[PDB]
Amino acid sequence: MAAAAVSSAKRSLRGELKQRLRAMSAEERLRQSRVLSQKVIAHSEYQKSKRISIFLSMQDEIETEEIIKDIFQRGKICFIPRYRFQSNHMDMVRIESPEEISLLPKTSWNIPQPGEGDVREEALSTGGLDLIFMPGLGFDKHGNRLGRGKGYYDAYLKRCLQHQEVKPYTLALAFKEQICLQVPVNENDMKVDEVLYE
Ligand SMILES: [Mg+2]
Ligand SMILES: [Mg+2]
Ligand SMILES: [Mg+2]
Ligand SMILES: [Mg+2]
Ligand SMILES: [Mg+2]
Ligand SMILES: [Mg+2]
Ligand SMILES: [Mg+2]
Ligand SMILES: [Mg+2]
Ligand SMILES: [Mg+2]
Ligand SMILES: [Mg+2]
Ligand SMILES: [Mg+2]
Ligand SMILES: [Mg+2]
Ligand code: NI
Ligand code: NI
Ligand code: NI
């Protein structure tokens, strides 16, 4: 019953967060995205990181395009999510340029990811990750994260705590609108090291 009461709060907050996000102008999204991009490029953990995981942005997410360009300009090794829609399973798969993203097939969420027969280098098979940019519907200032309900990123973060002597740095990119007072969590949810916004 306590488990269910947590899920209910998470579900209620998602709907509340999604309404706010849907109500944002396209040009305001692009604006905070530009503010976060510049903040990320200045960020010391980003500048030091050599192997990176970043997400490809949905319409209700901070746009990562300018970050991805910077990543490749600085010769960083770039990995992106490849979701296995059957379960809460994802890997991080290597892409070799920003332009490759444009030719990839898309999922039912209209997000690019290498297809089923496209054999990719997975981050955890070649040394893990220094830095993971974390998407999500909401974050609080304690680093608690509210995902979309599937727990892909919670599960993946636990996997990185195998393989890696030193865990990845986890950097969430959030609209000011996604910043919450209290994000409902259970013992299974994974905090992020830092939430960027403004
Ligand atoms: Mg690092
Ligand atoms: Mg956007
Ligand atoms: Mg699938
Ligand atoms: Mg992997
Ligand atoms: Mg390739
Ligand atoms: Mg496509
Ligand atoms: Mg996984
Ligand atoms: Mg709140
Ligand atoms: Mg979570
Ligand atoms: Mg937590
Ligand atoms: Mg923090
Ligand atoms: Mg701030
Ligand atoms: Ni897999
Ligand atoms: Ni190659
Ligand atoms: Ni608090």
mmCIF file of C-alpha atoms and ligand atoms in Angstrom:
data_model
loop_
_atom_site.group_PDB
_atom_site.id
_atom_site.type_symbol
_atom_site.label_atom_id
_atom_site.label_comp_id
_atom_site.label_asym_id
_atom_site.label_seq_id
_atom_site.Cartn_x
_atom_site.Cartn_y
_atom_site.Cartn_z
ATOM 1 C CA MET A 1 0.000 0.000 0.000
ATOM 2 C CA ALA A 2 2.959 2.297 0.714
ATOM 3 C CA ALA A 3 4.456 1.207 -2.650
ATOM 4 C CA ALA A 4 1.197 2.104 -4.419
ATOM 5 C CA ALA A 5 0.911 5.432 -2.582
ATOM 6 C CA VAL A 6 4.400 6.321 -3.920
ATOM 7 C CA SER A 7 3.409 5.349 -7.512
ATOM 8 C CA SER A 8 0.262 7.467 -7.209
ATOM 9 C CA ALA A 9 2.228 10.578 -6.141
ATOM 10 C CA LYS A 10 4.739 9.985 -8.943
ATOM 11 C CA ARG A 11 1.912 9.579 -11.466
ATOM 12 C CA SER A 12 0.151 12.776 -10.206
ATOM 13 C CA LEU A 13 3.371 14.730 -10.398
ATOM 14 C CA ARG A 14 4.109 13.482 -13.948
ATOM 15 C CA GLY A 15 0.727 14.758 -15.160
ATOM 16 C CA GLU A 16 1.312 18.085 -13.415
ATOM 17 C CA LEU A 17 4.841 18.306 -14.849
ATOM 18 C CA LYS A 18 3.676 17.340 -18.373
ATOM 19 C CA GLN A 19 0.973 20.048 -18.384
ATOM 20 C CA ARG A 20 3.615 22.715 -17.555
ATOM 21 C CA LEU A 21 5.928 21.372 -20.254
ATOM 22 C CA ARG A 22 3.181 21.204 -22.914
ATOM 23 C CA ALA A 23 2.325 24.860 -22.027
ATOM 24 C CA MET A 24 5.837 26.145 -22.834
ATOM 25 C CA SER A 25 6.482 27.979 -26.097
ATOM 26 C CA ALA A 26 8.858 26.388 -28.614
ATOM 27 C CA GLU A 27 11.090 29.499 -28.454
ATOM 28 C CA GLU A 28 11.218 29.482 -24.649
ATOM 29 C CA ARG A 29 12.365 25.842 -24.739
ATOM 30 C CA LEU A 30 15.110 26.827 -27.183
ATOM 31 C CA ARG A 31 16.079 29.720 -24.872
ATOM 32 C CA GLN A 32 16.651 27.757 -21.628
ATOM 33 C CA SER A 33 18.328 25.137 -23.823
ATOM 34 C CA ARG A 34 20.842 27.726 -24.974
ATOM 35 C CA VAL A 35 21.380 28.826 -21.346
ATOM 36 C CA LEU A 36 22.032 25.213 -20.250
ATOM 37 C CA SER A 37 24.270 24.512 -23.254
ATOM 38 C CA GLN A 38 26.567 27.391 -22.272
ATOM 39 C CA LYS A 39 26.459 26.249 -18.624
ATOM 40 C CA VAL A 40 27.412 22.684 -19.675
ATOM 41 C CA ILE A 41 30.298 23.828 -21.891
ATOM 42 C CA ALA A 42 31.674 25.810 -18.894
ATOM 43 C CA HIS A 43 31.135 22.877 -16.545
ATOM 44 C CA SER A 44 34.343 21.354 -15.058
ATOM 45 C CA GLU A 45 33.079 17.739 -14.992
ATOM 46 C CA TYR A 46 32.040 18.061 -18.646
ATOM 47 C CA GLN A 47 35.386 19.557 -19.751
ATOM 48 C CA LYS A 48 37.320 16.762 -17.964
ATOM 49 C CA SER A 49 35.090 13.884 -19.138
ATOM 50 C CA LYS A 50 36.349 11.787 -22.038
ATOM 51 C CA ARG A 51 33.511 9.213 -22.419
ATOM 52 C CA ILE A 52 30.017 10.605 -22.428
ATOM 53 C CA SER A 53 26.401 9.482 -22.506
ATOM 54 C CA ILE A 54 23.848 12.053 -23.762
ATOM 55 C CA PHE A 55 20.159 11.741 -24.743
ATOM 56 C CA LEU A 56 18.523 12.897 -27.983
ATOM 57 C CA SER A 57 15.845 15.421 -27.028
ATOM 58 C CA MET A 58 12.079 14.915 -27.079
ATOM 59 C CA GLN A 59 9.833 17.948 -27.521
ATOM 60 C CA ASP A 60 9.376 18.363 -23.771
ATOM 61 C CA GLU A 61 13.127 18.118 -22.966
ATOM 62 C CA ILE A 62 16.076 20.507 -22.858
ATOM 63 C CA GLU A 63 17.502 20.432 -26.414
ATOM 64 C CA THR A 64 20.942 18.743 -26.429
ATOM 65 C CA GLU A 65 21.901 19.437 -30.082
ATOM 66 C CA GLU A 66 24.459 22.167 -29.354
ATOM 67 C CA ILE A 67 26.014 20.008 -26.584
ATOM 68 C CA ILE A 68 26.359 17.056 -28.987
ATOM 69 C CA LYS A 69 28.190 19.304 -31.481
ATOM 70 C CA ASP A 70 30.557 20.519 -28.744
ATOM 71 C CA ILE A 71 31.133 16.913 -27.602
ATOM 72 C CA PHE A 72 32.486 15.904 -31.030
ATOM 73 C CA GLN A 73 34.470 19.159 -31.471
ATOM 74 C CA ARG A 74 36.339 18.292 -28.300
ATOM 75 C CA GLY A 75 37.011 14.679 -29.411
ATOM 76 C CA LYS A 76 34.905 13.130 -26.651
ATOM 77 C CA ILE A 77 33.603 9.604 -27.089
ATOM 78 C CA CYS A 78 29.818 9.924 -27.488
ATOM 79 C CA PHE A 79 27.220 7.295 -26.503
ATOM 80 C CA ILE A 80 23.435 7.528 -26.872
ATOM 81 C CA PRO A 81 20.518 5.490 -25.465
ATOM 82 C CA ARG A 82 19.260 2.459 -27.333
ATOM 83 C CA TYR A 83 16.009 1.304 -25.629
ATOM 84 C CA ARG A 84 14.692 -2.285 -25.753
ATOM 85 C CA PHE A 85 10.998 -1.509 -25.581
ATOM 86 C CA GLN A 86 10.015 -4.972 -24.286
ATOM 87 C CA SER A 87 11.512 -4.213 -20.831
ATOM 88 C CA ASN A 88 13.181 -1.521 -18.700
ATOM 89 C CA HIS A 89 16.415 -2.276 -20.634
ATOM 90 C CA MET A 90 18.699 0.234 -22.338
ATOM 91 C CA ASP A 91 22.341 0.341 -23.441
ATOM 92 C CA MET A 92 24.458 3.301 -24.397
ATOM 93 C CA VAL A 93 25.697 2.900 -27.936
ATOM 94 C CA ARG A 94 28.524 4.771 -29.691
ATOM 95 C CA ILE A 95 27.788 7.326 -32.439
ATOM 96 C CA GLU A 96 30.667 8.808 -34.515
ATOM 97 C CA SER A 97 29.300 12.228 -35.568
ATOM 98 C CA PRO A 98 26.329 14.610 -35.064
ATOM 99 C CA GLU A 99 25.391 13.976 -38.698
ATOM 100 C CA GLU A 100 24.995 10.211 -38.240
ATOM 101 C CA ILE A 101 22.031 10.964 -35.969
ATOM 102 C CA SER A 102 20.146 12.311 -38.991
ATOM 103 C CA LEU A 103 20.210 8.961 -40.837
ATOM 104 C CA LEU A 104 19.267 6.691 -37.926
ATOM 105 C CA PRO A 105 15.856 5.014 -37.792
ATOM 106 C CA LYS A 106 13.404 6.266 -35.198
ATOM 107 C CA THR A 107 11.386 4.616 -32.457
ATOM 108 C CA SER A 108 7.677 5.079 -31.654
ATOM 109 C CA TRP A 109 8.737 8.103 -29.562
ATOM 110 C CA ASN A 110 10.168 9.652 -32.745
ATOM 111 C CA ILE A 111 13.695 9.555 -31.315
ATOM 112 C CA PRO A 112 16.694 8.284 -33.290
ATOM 113 C CA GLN A 113 18.516 5.134 -32.215
ATOM 114 C CA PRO A 114 20.516 2.514 -34.117
ATOM 115 C CA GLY A 115 18.305 -0.281 -35.495
ATOM 116 C CA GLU A 116 18.112 -3.889 -34.311
ATOM 117 C CA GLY A 117 20.737 -5.305 -36.697
ATOM 118 C CA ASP A 118 23.125 -2.339 -36.375
ATOM 119 C CA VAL A 119 26.025 -3.766 -34.294
ATOM 120 C CA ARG A 120 27.236 -1.075 -31.914
ATOM 121 C CA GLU A 121 29.974 -0.524 -29.361
ATOM 122 C CA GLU A 122 28.273 -0.378 -25.961
ATOM 123 C CA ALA A 123 29.694 1.997 -23.346
ATOM 124 C CA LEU A 124 29.967 -0.708 -20.643
ATOM 125 C CA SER A 125 31.900 -3.081 -22.906
ATOM 126 C CA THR A 126 34.675 -0.547 -23.671
ATOM 127 C CA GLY A 127 35.330 1.031 -20.277
ATOM 128 C CA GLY A 128 32.099 2.608 -19.012
ATOM 129 C CA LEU A 129 31.255 6.325 -18.770
ATOM 130 C CA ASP A 130 32.789 9.418 -17.136
ATOM 131 C CA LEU A 131 29.622 11.508 -17.437
ATOM 132 C CA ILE A 132 25.940 10.819 -18.023
ATOM 133 C CA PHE A 133 23.511 13.593 -18.946
ATOM 134 C CA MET A 134 20.224 12.616 -17.273
ATOM 135 C CA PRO A 135 16.835 13.424 -18.779
ATOM 136 C CA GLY A 136 13.617 13.280 -16.734
ATOM 137 C CA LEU A 137 10.232 14.843 -16.181
ATOM 138 C CA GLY A 138 11.158 16.368 -12.820
ATOM 139 C CA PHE A 139 13.995 16.906 -10.375
ATOM 140 C CA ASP A 140 14.268 18.405 -6.922
ATOM 141 C CA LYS A 141 17.314 20.270 -5.491
ATOM 142 C CA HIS A 142 18.299 17.120 -3.575
ATOM 143 C CA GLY A 143 19.036 15.331 -6.860
ATOM 144 C CA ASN A 144 15.929 13.129 -6.733
ATOM 145 C CA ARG A 145 14.674 12.368 -10.261
ATOM 146 C CA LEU A 146 11.251 11.668 -11.692
ATOM 147 C CA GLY A 147 11.433 9.701 -14.950
ATOM 148 C CA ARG A 148 8.649 8.670 -17.376
ATOM 149 C CA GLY A 149 7.646 5.565 -15.454
ATOM 150 C CA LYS A 150 9.802 2.862 -17.009
ATOM 151 C CA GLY A 151 12.841 3.163 -14.735
ATOM 152 C CA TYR A 152 15.316 2.732 -17.637
ATOM 153 C CA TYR A 153 17.802 5.256 -16.200
ATOM 154 C CA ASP A 154 17.542 3.981 -12.609
ATOM 155 C CA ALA A 155 18.305 0.429 -13.903
ATOM 156 C CA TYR A 156 21.143 1.586 -16.169
ATOM 157 C CA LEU A 157 22.784 3.604 -13.340
ATOM 158 C CA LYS A 158 22.822 0.473 -11.169
ATOM 159 C CA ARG A 159 24.538 -1.413 -14.035
ATOM 160 C CA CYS A 160 27.292 1.237 -14.185
ATOM 161 C CA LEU A 161 27.932 0.351 -10.553
ATOM 162 C CA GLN A 162 29.426 -2.831 -11.992
ATOM 163 C CA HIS A 163 32.287 -2.377 -14.488
ATOM 164 C CA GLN A 164 33.266 0.937 -13.091
ATOM 165 C CA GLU A 165 35.678 1.391 -10.196
ATOM 166 C CA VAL A 166 34.644 5.037 -10.190
ATOM 167 C CA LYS A 167 30.956 5.702 -10.862
ATOM 168 C CA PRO A 168 29.893 8.147 -13.632
ATOM 169 C CA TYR A 169 29.119 11.744 -12.849
ATOM 170 C CA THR A 170 25.382 12.290 -13.432
ATOM 171 C CA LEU A 171 24.307 15.658 -14.739
ATOM 172 C CA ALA A 172 20.587 16.372 -15.240
ATOM 173 C CA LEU A 173 19.436 19.123 -17.624
ATOM 174 C CA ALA A 174 16.179 20.681 -16.496
ATOM 175 C CA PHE A 175 13.810 23.453 -17.498
ATOM 176 C CA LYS A 176 13.153 25.821 -14.598
ATOM 177 C CA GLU A 177 9.614 24.438 -14.950
ATOM 178 C CA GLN A 178 10.783 20.882 -14.088
ATOM 179 C CA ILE A 179 12.279 21.863 -10.744
ATOM 180 C CA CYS A 180 10.087 20.536 -7.905
ATOM 181 C CA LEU A 181 9.992 20.999 -4.125
ATOM 182 C CA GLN A 182 9.764 17.275 -3.317
ATOM 183 C CA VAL A 183 10.044 14.456 -5.866
ATOM 184 C CA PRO A 184 8.421 11.239 -4.562
ATOM 185 C CA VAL A 185 10.975 8.394 -4.483
ATOM 186 C CA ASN A 186 11.406 4.817 -3.244
ATOM 187 C CA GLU A 187 14.500 2.801 -2.256
ATOM 188 C CA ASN A 188 14.938 1.822 -5.930
ATOM 189 C CA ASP A 189 15.209 5.365 -7.366
ATOM 190 C CA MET A 190 18.681 6.756 -8.177
ATOM 191 C CA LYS A 191 19.754 10.317 -7.271
ATOM 192 C CA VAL A 192 21.729 12.446 -9.704
ATOM 193 C CA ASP A 193 24.933 14.260 -8.611
ATOM 194 C CA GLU A 194 23.761 17.628 -9.964
ATOM 195 C CA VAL A 195 20.692 19.310 -11.495
ATOM 196 C CA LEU A 196 21.378 22.152 -13.956
ATOM 197 C CA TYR A 197 18.774 24.816 -14.735
ATOM 198 C CA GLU A 198 17.967 28.524 -15.283
HETATM 199 MG MG MG B 1 35.067 12.923 -15.392
HETATM 200 MG MG MG B 2 12.539 21.367 -26.760
HETATM 201 MG MG MG B 3 12.669 -2.430 -28.968
HETATM 202 MG MG MG B 4 26.139 0.107 -22.262
HETATM 203 MG MG MG B 5 28.554 4.521 -36.910
HETATM 204 MG MG MG B 6 14.569 8.307 -39.040
HETATM 205 MG MG MG B 7 19.808 -1.650 -18.156
HETATM 206 MG MG MG B 8 6.874 21.170 -6.772
HETATM 207 MG MG MG B 9 13.472 7.484 -10.574
HETATM 208 MG MG MG B 10 16.329 9.224 -5.105
HETATM 209 MG MG MG B 11 22.954 17.987 -5.793
HETATM 210 MG MG MG B 12 21.186 26.876 -10.939
HETATM 211 NI NI NI B 13 21.250 -4.820 -24.348
HETATM 212 NI NI NI B 14 34.944 2.711 -36.255
HETATM 213 NI NI NI B 15 13.680 19.173 0.503
#
